[PDB]
Amino acid sequence: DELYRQSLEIISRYLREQATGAKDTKPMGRSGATSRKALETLRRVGDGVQRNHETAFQGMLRKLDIKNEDDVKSLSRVMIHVFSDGVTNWGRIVTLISFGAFVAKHLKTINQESCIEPLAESITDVLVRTKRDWLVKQRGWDGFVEFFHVEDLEG
Protein backbone atom coordinates (compact mmCIF):
# COMPACT_ATOMS: atom_id res chain seq x y z
CA ASP A 1 0.00 0.00 0.00
CA GLU A 2 2.21 2.76 -1.35
CA LEU A 3 -0.18 5.61 -0.52
CA TYR A 4 -0.45 4.52 3.13
CA ARG A 5 3.32 4.05 3.51
CA GLN A 6 4.13 7.38 1.88
CA SER A 7 1.47 9.20 3.94
CA LEU A 8 2.77 7.73 7.20
CA GLU A 9 6.33 8.74 6.36
CA ILE A 10 5.37 12.33 5.55
CA ILE A 11 3.05 12.82 8.52
CA SER A 12 5.37 11.09 11.01
CA ARG A 13 8.35 13.15 9.86
CA TYR A 14 6.43 16.43 10.09
CA LEU A 15 5.07 15.69 13.59
CA ARG A 16 8.48 14.58 14.91
CA GLU A 17 10.31 17.57 13.37
CA GLN A 18 7.68 19.94 14.81
CA ALA A 19 8.07 18.36 18.26
CA THR A 20 11.89 18.14 18.34
CA GLY A 21 12.91 21.14 16.21
CA ALA A 22 15.36 18.95 14.27
CA LYS A 23 15.30 17.67 10.68
CA ASP A 24 15.51 13.86 10.24
CA THR A 25 18.54 13.19 8.04
CA LYS A 26 17.51 9.68 6.94
CA PRO A 27 16.44 9.12 3.33
CA MET A 28 12.79 8.75 2.46
CA GLY A 29 11.63 5.36 1.22
CA ARG A 30 9.77 4.91 -2.07
CA SER A 31 8.85 8.04 -4.04
CA GLY A 32 11.41 10.05 -2.06
CA ALA A 33 11.50 13.10 -4.33
CA THR A 34 7.74 13.62 -3.92
CA SER A 35 7.80 12.84 -0.18
CA ARG A 36 10.61 15.37 0.33
CA LYS A 37 8.66 18.04 -1.54
CA ALA A 38 5.48 17.16 0.37
CA LEU A 39 7.30 17.53 3.69
CA GLU A 40 8.82 20.84 2.51
CA THR A 41 5.30 21.99 1.58
CA LEU A 42 3.96 21.08 5.07
CA ARG A 43 6.78 23.06 6.67
CA ARG A 44 5.72 26.12 4.70
CA VAL A 45 1.94 25.78 4.86
CA GLY A 46 1.32 23.92 8.17
CA ASP A 47 3.41 26.35 10.18
CA GLY A 48 1.23 29.23 8.91
CA VAL A 49 -1.99 27.38 9.78
CA GLN A 50 -0.98 26.89 13.42
CA ARG A 51 -0.37 30.64 13.77
CA ASN A 52 -3.35 31.87 11.69
CA HIS A 53 -5.62 29.71 13.87
CA GLU A 54 -3.68 29.89 17.11
CA THR A 55 -6.65 30.86 19.27
CA ALA A 56 -8.88 28.06 17.95
CA PHE A 57 -6.03 25.53 18.11
CA GLN A 58 -5.31 26.43 21.76
CA GLY A 59 -9.05 26.25 22.52
CA MET A 60 -9.44 22.78 21.02
CA LEU A 61 -6.25 21.51 22.71
CA ARG A 62 -7.71 22.59 26.08
CA LYS A 63 -11.10 20.98 25.35
CA LEU A 64 -9.34 17.69 24.50
CA ASP A 65 -7.24 17.66 27.73
CA ILE A 66 -4.42 15.37 26.56
CA LYS A 67 -2.53 13.91 29.53
CA ASN A 68 -1.57 10.34 28.61
CA GLU A 69 -1.65 7.34 26.23
CA ASP A 70 -5.41 6.74 26.65
CA ASP A 71 -6.27 10.37 25.79
CA VAL A 72 -4.11 10.15 22.66
CA LYS A 73 -5.87 6.91 21.62
CA SER A 74 -9.26 8.66 21.97
CA LEU A 75 -8.35 11.23 19.29
CA SER A 76 -9.12 8.86 16.41
CA ARG A 77 -12.85 9.05 17.11
CA VAL A 78 -12.70 12.86 17.28
CA MET A 79 -10.79 13.08 13.99
CA ILE A 80 -13.39 10.89 12.25
CA HIS A 81 -16.14 13.08 13.69
CA VAL A 82 -14.64 16.43 12.70
CA PHE A 83 -12.38 15.74 9.68
CA SER A 84 -13.94 12.73 7.96
CA ASP A 85 -17.54 13.88 8.28
CA GLY A 86 -17.20 16.94 6.05
CA VAL A 87 -16.16 18.12 2.60
CA THR A 88 -12.70 17.09 1.51
CA ASN A 89 -10.22 19.62 0.20
CA TRP A 90 -6.47 20.02 0.61
CA GLY A 91 -6.97 22.83 3.13
CA ARG A 92 -8.87 20.52 5.49
CA ILE A 93 -6.17 17.90 5.13
CA VAL A 94 -3.55 20.51 6.07
CA THR A 95 -5.64 21.52 9.11
CA LEU A 96 -5.85 17.85 10.16
CA ILE A 97 -2.07 17.42 9.93
CA SER A 98 -1.25 20.90 11.35
CA PHE A 99 -3.41 20.36 14.42
CA GLY A 100 -1.64 16.98 14.69
CA ALA A 101 1.67 18.84 14.85
CA PHE A 102 0.17 21.19 17.46
CA VAL A 103 -0.79 18.17 19.56
CA ALA A 104 2.65 16.58 18.98
CA LYS A 105 4.36 19.70 20.36
CA HIS A 106 2.06 19.50 23.37
CA LEU A 107 3.19 15.87 23.89
CA LYS A 108 6.83 17.03 23.83
CA THR A 109 6.07 19.67 26.52
CA ILE A 110 4.52 17.10 28.87
CA ASN A 111 7.44 14.69 28.20
CA GLN A 112 5.25 12.09 26.46
CA GLU A 113 7.20 12.05 23.20
CA SER A 114 6.60 8.31 22.90
CA CYS A 115 2.95 8.98 21.90
CA ILE A 116 3.94 11.07 18.85
CA GLU A 117 4.45 8.13 16.50
CA PRO A 118 1.17 6.43 17.56
CA LEU A 119 -0.53 9.81 16.97
CA ALA A 120 0.98 10.08 13.46
CA GLU A 121 -0.28 6.56 12.69
CA SER A 122 -3.79 7.50 13.87
CA ILE A 123 -3.88 10.63 11.69
CA THR A 124 -2.61 8.60 8.73
CA ASP A 125 -5.26 5.93 9.30
CA VAL A 126 -8.04 8.50 9.36
CA LEU A 127 -6.74 10.32 6.24
CA VAL A 128 -5.92 7.35 4.03
CA ARG A 129 -8.56 4.88 5.12
CA THR A 130 -11.48 7.37 4.98
CA LYS A 131 -10.41 9.51 1.97
CA ARG A 132 -8.56 7.14 -0.37
CA ASP A 133 -10.92 7.73 -3.31
CA TRP A 134 -10.49 11.48 -3.10
CA LEU A 135 -6.72 11.27 -2.59
CA VAL A 136 -6.33 9.01 -5.64
CA LYS A 137 -8.52 11.30 -7.80
CA GLN A 138 -6.43 14.30 -6.67
CA ARG A 139 -3.13 12.55 -7.60
CA GLY A 140 -2.06 11.81 -4.03
CA TRP A 141 1.04 13.52 -2.71
CA ASP A 142 2.09 14.57 -6.20
CA GLY A 143 -1.19 16.48 -6.37
CA PHE A 144 -0.60 17.98 -2.90
CA VAL A 145 2.79 19.30 -3.99
CA GLU A 146 1.34 20.63 -7.30
CA PHE A 147 -1.62 22.29 -5.52
CA PHE A 148 0.60 24.30 -3.13
CA HIS A 149 3.49 25.01 -5.55
CA VAL A 150 4.42 28.68 -5.71
CA GLU A 151 6.15 30.05 -8.82
CA ASP A 152 9.30 32.15 -8.44
CA LEU A 153 8.77 35.92 -8.56
CA GLU A 154 10.31 37.91 -11.41
CA GLY A 155 13.22 40.23 -10.56
Ligand X SMILES: C[C@@H]1[C@@H](C)C/C=C/[C@H](O)[C@@H]2CC[C@H]2CN2C[C@@]3(CCCc4cc(Cl)ccc43)COc3ccc(cc32)C(=O)NS1(=O)=O
d(CA 59, CA 101): 15
In the bound complex, what is the minimum distance in angstroms from residue 22's beta carbon to ligand X?
Answer: 21
Per the CB < 8 A criterion, the answer to whether 75 and 64 are in contact is: yes
78 binds ligand X, rule: CB under 6 A? yes
- Which of 31, 95, 124, 138 binds ligand X (CB under 6 A)? It is 95
CB-wise, 24 or 121, nearer to ligand X? Answer: 121
Q: Does 110 bind ligand X (CB under 6 A)?
A: no
Query: Which amino acid is it at 25?
Result: T
Nearest of 38, 125, 55, 40 to residue 90 by alpha carbon? 38
| Cα–Cα distance for residue pair 79/25, rounded to 1 Å | 30
Residues that bind ligand X (CB under 6 A): 53, 56-57, 60, 75, 78-79, 82-83, 92, 95-96, 99-100, 103, 119, 123
